[PDB]
Design a protein around this nucleic acid. Structure first.
Ligand SMILES: [Mn+2]
Ligand SMILES: [Zn+2]
Length: 1592
RNA sequence: CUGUGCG
């Protein structure tokens, strides 16, 4: 006991703050025995930890450690026979309980495991306690450290060290000892030697069911002879019988097949699309009614804007009366406008924004003056004081910033109102809800109206997205088949011509699909244009793409200018097809275009599968797919009807049709319906499993199986490996024959393949799983509400205003629905802590009761019944505790909606009514730590996975989410597999050199004419099984490089069989949809597995899953070795030369033949048979000819490569992620560089830049001299960065480049004397860091100037709103969450929402107080503060640049632009040389002269630019910024400290510019590869390239 | 939290 007395001495620094410190301490002092003292030491430490955890949250210690039932029976409460559970901290007040259970886990994984376990075990008790008792709120405090606020945090580590020393000094179980010794460590991979590996009478039958036929020692000549005999048998048993899988194209017959499948002849639709689709007829009507045909309006718009701003304050705490006040103001200003200037209502007002007795108001709602009067005369007599009272609130407790001098207090004279009403006739709309063709023959129209069609489409799309952008929290004053009258709908406006305006009327709000009606107003007259029904989210693409599509069309058609006349009958149909695709966003259309891509791939080449036509036919609905399908097939026929073999200008035809097929990518891939999306993903997940028949019901979730479960697992394993080498019945069922595994393994072992096992670099060196895609989880909501109510009860030390809702907004950043739900939850929780029968038998939750079960009439009339004690007089905004329910009922009653009133009434009626291994595993003991593992688990779970989907253009892609332990095991397996793959050479998944080698090999083979085999494999993911990898690694040896020690992968085998024992959860939403309840296989399976066998199915368990996204590289290497075996076999049999490349989903086989290709079908069929014998089913989409090759959608043809224009332009048009305008412009620059890399066009990128500039300008931000990409660029995207193009734009701003020339001369001088001229550097940073203008001067006198230059160059100024920081803004981001260069460095050191909704959030957020000063303010006052001096110097570029006296009123946000010119010039000097110092000179082709170009950049900045160079420079120059906000999480700073090649050539000088300026982003741009290294360019664009070369 | 413009 050398330390026991030392422990007694050291534990003397402890405060007995509570009594039982004293009690436990005196028990500890008075006991000296070997066995207990450790026990009470650990339990006292745990008690101290739990008290520190819970008394920080107003705890009440459970000193007796009793159950919930007795503490609830302490006072008067009925016992509902609650299940037993021991609480750590309890807080009971009135009829509310707060329970806190805390724990400590140093290791994270155990921390989240215990966290999930405790919340799961506590949540289920709420459903029982609430049913016939009181409520509760579960909270848990998880700490990863033993730290506390009662000790000086230097003894606890010493206490732990001394305790572990004491326990290791002497003992007296084994696993308990290991757990306790490992749970007191702080920081601790492979080599799991300490694991027990105990058997449970199950390993054996797994072994002989998997490792009986595996030898891996078969010699070579026997394999040769066996393959010979197999080939001879195959030749005359299945090939001579005509039972193959591939055949020749037979072009013409394929044309009739395509015409039959696509061109519908049994359909009743007409051959003119305009009347087939509602959008087509609507746009046709508007465009052919439009082509053939004053300060009052701005005042009206201004007053609308100001009332629209003031309404958002909601300072009246009520809605309907607020709306009545606002529209009363609107009508008062209306009648004050109409009293004078009588020539305004008929002429200047009708032609603006008005229609029959229907005037728009705040919140973009159109309202009728008649019923407006019918509602204004209310509250008159009942309470005429109202208008007075709401007037008096505009003086006190109001912003008092208004122009309502007289337009507010005047009573509306109803005589003028009725006179105005009778002045305008009744033309109320009908909005038709739920056959003669004069459709103008679009094929015989001029070449101008199509662009007008496109502009009309863009206007309609933007109007739809504006209607999307409207507010959600809007309730109509008066509520309302086949024809509904419109009186109080919502409206949007759009502009077409000087006199006529289009209007869009819609009745409902939200984000889901609605019904809309389109009307027109020519000269005050109302016209009917149409109506339709759609979901706005799928029309973000055409919002401004009215020009890029056009020029794309002319270029696309002009590709076919080899023959004159073919453009005439192919162009107009091409634009019509593009329009049809744009107006019809659906998965079926893009799948159909992909099917046409596959059809073209089959047809243009020589050999194709026999099962293509079944994968091209898609069922049609709504008669909308038929027209686009007919258009596509007609185009294909017209291009392919005549002589169209491979003996003519066929490459351009192929490119044309391929781009036509890729036109599918314009469709937004964002799962139009979500619940059906989970249904589809789940059923396509579960169909192969059940059709195999090995899916069991919910397992034990802890590593226990029943006899039936293990028996069916054995049956599945036996069935999978029960395939023969001769039977042809098993060609589609999953499985494989172990014999061929033995063959391939044995042949690989004796170095007979292209590679061997001579590996180097030895590899042995909190969301809920049940729901994916939901914004919030039950666990997260419970935690947030627990924290909220804890803070609530904490501050009451009554009365509570609505400001508590602010806290709800503080912790967060469908969403509004969850916010309202949690607001109601916290309201009712506060209410209960302050102090129709079908719901009883059904779910007892009153907040989930749907309004679809009862009529609205009974709901409205029952809430208006007698109520004495359930309502109170007045609104009573103070809301003291004890009467919250009455206030909520009154607030819901005064508002139009009664559903909240109904549920509040319902809930107001109370209608909701001394061993060391067992007694020491509840305080802090880490029992769940993995110490002994079985064949099926690892003592820490059963590898629970969660299912999810990912949107793709073609079809939804499966995805699996893993827990933390599963995540780490999967990542270590992946690391080992990647080590093996790096040992491999031919793999192409992440090794770019091999990818380039494959590209060059395929291109040279195509140029020579070798045979191509682009194998595409179907159902690659779900069909594979881990058992394949188990057997493969069992038969493998993995020899070491030099030691030849035959590495034993026992840990790898165990972890892989663990993955074989993975369990997957089914989402709760699909389970509920099936339970609530067309014939579906999954539906029948679920209904068969509800009660017939066991309980509801929530966990699925089987063998052959191979979850996509988890076993990438293992599957890659398996497929690689298998294809190597097959290529070796085919080479040895048919003496032909194979080579192959693998990408784990599709592969490439290049075949060089000796010594016209119709004699080689037999080898392809034999290879297909061999692959099908393996678990390598090949999709029918493969093309096995020798004309064109495909790999990862990178096609190669004889002579050149496809330009892939439409895919890239669609990508550039879409995925405009809006966070800040600068980042948007940079992303656009990157995507345009990528687009121009593949020789697209130079006139199209200009249109994209114009479109994005127009889009950002519409947002109200305003154009900037940088803005988006410059207009009218050139092919000099090559050898040019963002700096160069920005400099070119700046030069283009100035017509006569006169001061730019001199300032470039000055920049040339400063570059000259900073590179080698005399001595400089390290003095510039002193000048740079302060500010703006004096620095201009300082450079000027460093180069030589006078005061005239000083006061002349500083004249050009531009407005920068982001001057005092960054634009504060909140977007529609995921719930629950310093120069930028430092942030990028931090990120690089470290290792669901729609684009439409993102744009909506951007536009909504920038309109609030975003710019900062001093304070936050708006933008409009900033832009209106400018002075329009117009002194002939601020007019050459309006709204871009300004002169000094033009910005006298506001000057903080005003900088000169020539500093940006310095920034760009010095950036180019550091980046790509000094040749940009010259003057641009201009120079003094059949559309088909394409060729590749290389960058011609020269770098004098030590082009290598290794890592840790900038870190040393920033440490030297800016130690203050180096210390904090930089390199906290780093351990190898020492290499950077000891002169890591410090004092670079130019790194020191031009990094401070990026420090100061936040629109360059050069250093981050500096440290990456160009990623292109080649650019496709036409000689037509090369002809007019500008020349800029600099002399010495 | 707090959207009003493409002429
Ligand atoms: Mn492929
Ligand atoms: Zn028609």
């Amino acid at each position: 006991d050398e330390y026991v007395q030392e422990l007694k001495g050291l534990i003397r620094k402890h405060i007995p703050e509570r009594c039982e410190f004293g009690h436990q301490k005196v028990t500890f002092l008075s006991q000296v025995h070997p066995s207990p003292l450790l026990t009470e030491g650990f339990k006292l430490l745990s008690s101290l930890v739990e008290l520190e955890s819970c008394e920080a949250h107003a705890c009440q210690a459970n000193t007796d450690q009793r159950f919930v039932d007795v503490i609830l029976s302490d006072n008067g409460i009925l016992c509902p026979t609650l299940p037993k559970v021991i609480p750590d901290g309890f807080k009971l007040t009135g009829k509310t309980l707060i329970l806190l259970e805390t724990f400590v886990r140093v290791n994270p994984d155990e921390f989240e495991k215990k966290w999930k376990a405790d919340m799961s075990k506590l949540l289920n008790l709420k459903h029982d306690l609430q049913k016939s008792g009181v409520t509760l709120v579960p909270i848990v405090d998880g700490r990863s450290n033993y730290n506390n606020r009662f000790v000086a945090d230097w003894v606890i580590e010493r206490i732990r060290w001394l305790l572990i020393e004491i326990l290791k000094a002497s003992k007296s179980e084994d696993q308990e000892y290991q757990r306790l010794i490992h749970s007191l460590s702080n920081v601790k991979l492979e080599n799991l030697e300490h694991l027990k590996r105990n058997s449970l009478d199950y390993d054996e039958r797994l072994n002989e069911s998997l490792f009986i036929g595996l030898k891996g020692d078969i010699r070579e000549s026997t394999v040769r002879e066996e393959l010979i005999k197999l080939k001879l048998w195959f030749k005359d048993e299945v090939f001579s019988k005509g039972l193959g899988k591939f055949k020749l194209t037979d072009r013409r017959e394929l044309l009739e097949s395509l015409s039959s499948l696509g061109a519908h002849l049994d359909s009743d639709v007409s051959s003119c699309p305009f009347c087939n689709n509602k959008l087509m007829e609507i746009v046709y009507n508007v465009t052919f009614s439009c082509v053939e045909r004053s300060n009052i309006e701005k005042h009206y718009l201004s007053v609308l804007s100001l009332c629209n701003k003031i309404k958002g304050l909601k300072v009246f705490n009520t809605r309907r009366n607020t709306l009545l006040f606002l529209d009363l103001i609107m009508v008062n200003l209306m009648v004050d406008i109409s009293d004078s200037c009588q020539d305004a209502i008929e002429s200047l007002r009708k032609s603006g924004l008005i229609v029959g007795q229907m005037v728009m108001l705040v919140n973009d709602r159109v309202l009728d003056i008649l019923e407006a009067v019918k509602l204004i005369r209310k509250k008159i007599g009942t309470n005429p004081n109202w208008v007075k009272n709401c007037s008096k609130i505009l003086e006190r407790s109001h912003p008092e910033i208004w122009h309502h001098l007289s337009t507010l207090i005047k009573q509306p004279d109803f005589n003028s109102l009725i006179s105005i009403a009778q002045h305008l006739v009744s033309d109320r709309p009908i909005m038709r809800y739920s056959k003669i063709c004069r459709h103008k023959l679009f094929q015989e129209m001029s070449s101008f109206e199509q662009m007008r069609l496109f502009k009309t489409l863009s206007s309609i799309s933007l109007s739809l997205i504006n209607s999307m952008k409207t507010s959600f929290s809007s309730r109509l004053l008066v509520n309302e088949f086949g024809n509904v009258r419109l009186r109080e709908c919502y409206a949007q406006r759009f502009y077409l011509a000087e006199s006529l305006v289009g209007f869009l009327f819609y009745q409902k709000t939200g984000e889901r699909s609605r019904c809309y009606s389109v009307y027109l107003s020519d000269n005050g007259v109302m016209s009917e244009q149409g109506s339709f029904y759609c979901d706005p989210k799928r029309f973000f693409l055409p919002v401004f793409s009215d020009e890029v599509l056009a020029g794309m069309c002319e270029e696309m058609t002009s590709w076919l200018d080899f023959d004159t006349g073919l453009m005439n009958d192919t162009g107009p149909i091409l634009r019509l097809l593009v329009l049809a695709i744009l107006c019809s966003p659906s998965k079926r259309n893009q799948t159909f275009l992909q099917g046409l891509r596959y059809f073209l791939m089959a047809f243009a080449n020589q050999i194709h599968h026999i099962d293509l036509t079944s994968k091209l036919v898609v069922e049609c609905k709504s008669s909308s797919e038929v027209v686009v399908q007919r258009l596509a097939v007609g185009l294909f026929i017209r291009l392919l009807s005549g002589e169209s073999d491979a003996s003519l200008f066929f490459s351009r035809r192929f490119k044309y049709l391929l781009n036509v097929s890729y036109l599918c990518h314009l469709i937004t891939k964002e799962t139009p319906d979500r619940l059906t999306d989970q249904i589809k993903c789940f059923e396509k997940f579960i169909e192969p499993k059940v059709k195999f028949g090995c899916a069991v019901v919910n397992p034990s979730l802890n590593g226990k199986l029943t006899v039936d479960q293990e028996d069916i697992m054995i049956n599945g394993l036996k069935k999978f490996f029960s395939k023969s080498l001769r039977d042809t019945e098993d060609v589609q069922t999953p499985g494989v024959c172990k014999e061929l595994l033995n063959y391939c393994v044995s042949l690989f072992n004796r170095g007979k393949l292209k590679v061997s096992g001579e590996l180097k670099n030895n590899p042995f060196r909190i969301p809920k799983l049940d729901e994916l895609g939901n914004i919030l989880s039950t666990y997260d909501k419970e935690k947030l509400v627990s924290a909220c109510v804890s803070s609530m009860a904490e501050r009451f030390k009554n009365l509570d205003p609505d400001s508590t809702d602010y806290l709800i907004l503080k912790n967060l950043t469908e969403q509004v629905e969850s916010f309202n739900e949690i607001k109601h939850d916290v309201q009712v929780a506060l209410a209960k802590m302050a102090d129709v029968s079908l719901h009883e038998v059904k779910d007892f939750d009153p907040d989930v009761l749907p309004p679809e079960v009862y009529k609205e009439l009974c709901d409205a009339v029952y809430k208006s019944s007698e109520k004495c004690n359930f309502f109170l007089e007045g609104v009573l905004d103070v809301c003291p505790l004890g009467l919250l329910l009455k206030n909520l009922t009154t607030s819901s009653y005064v508002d139009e909606e009664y559903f909240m009133c109904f549920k509040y009434l319902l809930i107001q009626g109370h209608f909701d009514q001394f061993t060391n291994a067992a007694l020491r595993n509840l305080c802090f003991y880490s029992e769940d730590s993995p110490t002994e593992f079985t064949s099926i688990s690892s003592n820490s779970g059963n590898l629970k996975f969660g299912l999810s989907y990912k949107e793709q253009v073609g079809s939804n892609r499966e995805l699996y989410v893993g827990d933390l332990n599963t995540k780490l095991m999967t990542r270590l397996v992946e690391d080992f597999s990647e080590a093996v793959g790096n040992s491999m050479k031919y793999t192409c998944l992440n090794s770019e050199k091999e990818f380039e080698r494959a590209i060059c090999d395929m291109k040279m083979a195509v140029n020579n004419g070798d045979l191509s085999c682009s194998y595409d494999h179907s159902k690659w993911g779900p069909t594979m099984s881990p058992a394949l990898f188990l057997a493969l690694l069992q038969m493998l040896e993995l020899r070491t490089p030099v030691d030849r020690s035959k590495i034993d992968l026992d840990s790898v085998k165990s972890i892989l069989k663990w993955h074989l024992h993975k369990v997957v959860e089914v989402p709760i939403n699909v389970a509920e949809a099936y339970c609530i309840g067309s014939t579906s296989l999954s539906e029948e399976f679920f209904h068969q597995t509800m009660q017939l066998n066991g309980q509801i199915p929530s966990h699925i368990m089987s063998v052959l899953d191979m979850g996509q996204g988890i076993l990438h590289n293992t599957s890659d290497l398996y497929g690689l070795i298998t294809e190597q075996f097959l290529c070796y076999a085919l080479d040895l049999l048919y003496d032909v030369i194979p080579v192959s490349y693998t990408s784990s989903d599709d592969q490439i086989t290049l075949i060089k033949t000796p010594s016209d290709a119709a004699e080689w079908l037999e080898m392809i069929c034999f290879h297909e048979f061999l692959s099908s014998k393996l678990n390598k089913f090949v999709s029918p989409k493969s093309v096995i000819g020798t004309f064109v090759a495909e790999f990862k959608s990178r096609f190669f043809v004889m002579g050149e490569e496809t330009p892939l224009l439409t895919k890239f332009v669609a990508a550039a048009l879409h995925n405009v992620k809006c966070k800040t305008p600068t980042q948007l412009s940079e992303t656009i620059d990157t995507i345009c560089d990528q687009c121009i890399a593949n020789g697209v066009s130079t006139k199209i990128v200009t249109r994209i830049s114009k479109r994005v500039n127009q889009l950002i300008r519409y947002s109200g931000y305003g154009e900037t001299p940088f803005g988006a990409i410059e207009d009218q660029d050139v092919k000099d995207w090559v050898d040019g960065s963002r700096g160069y193009r920005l400099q070119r734009k700046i030069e283009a701003i100035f017509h006569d480049d006169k001061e730019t020339s001199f300032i470039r001369n000055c920049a040339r001088k400063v570059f000259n004397d900073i590179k080698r001229g005399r001595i400089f550097e390290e003095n510039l940073i002193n000048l740079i860091g302060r500010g703006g203008d004096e620095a201009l001067t300082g450079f000027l006198q460093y180069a030589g100037c006078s005061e005239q230059e000083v006061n002349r160059v500083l004249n050009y100024r531009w407005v920068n709103l982001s001057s005092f920081g960054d634009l504060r803004l909140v977007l529609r981001t995921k719930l629950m969450t310093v120069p930028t260069l430092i942030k990028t460095l931090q990120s690089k050191l470290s290792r669901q929402s729609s684009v439409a909704s993102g744009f909506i959030g951007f536009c909504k957020s920038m309109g609030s107080k975003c710019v900062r000063d001093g304070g936050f303010l708006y933008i409009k006052e900033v832009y209106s503060g400018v002075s329009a001096c117009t002194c002939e110097i601020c007019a050459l570029k309006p709204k871009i640049i300004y002169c000094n006296n033009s910005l006298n009123k506001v000057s903080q946000f005003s900088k000169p632009i020539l500093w940006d010119y310095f920034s760009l010039v010095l950036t180019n000097a550091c980046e790509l040389g000094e040749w940009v110092f010259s003057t641009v000179k201009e120079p003094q082709n059949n559309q088909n002269f394409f060729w590749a170009v290389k960058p011609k950049v020269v770098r004098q900045i030590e082009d290598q630019l290794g890592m840790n160079h900038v870190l040393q420079s920033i440490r030297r120059n800016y130690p203050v910024l180096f210390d904090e906000h930089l390199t906290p999480f780093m351990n190898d700073l020492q290499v950077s400290r000891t002169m890591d090649s410090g004092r670079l050539k130019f790194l020191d000088v031009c990094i401070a510019l990026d420090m100061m300026n936040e629109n360059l982003g050069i250093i981050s741009h500096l440290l990456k590869t160009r990623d292109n290294s080649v650019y496709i360019v036409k000689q037509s664009d090369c002809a007019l390239a500008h020349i800029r070369q600099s002399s010495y």
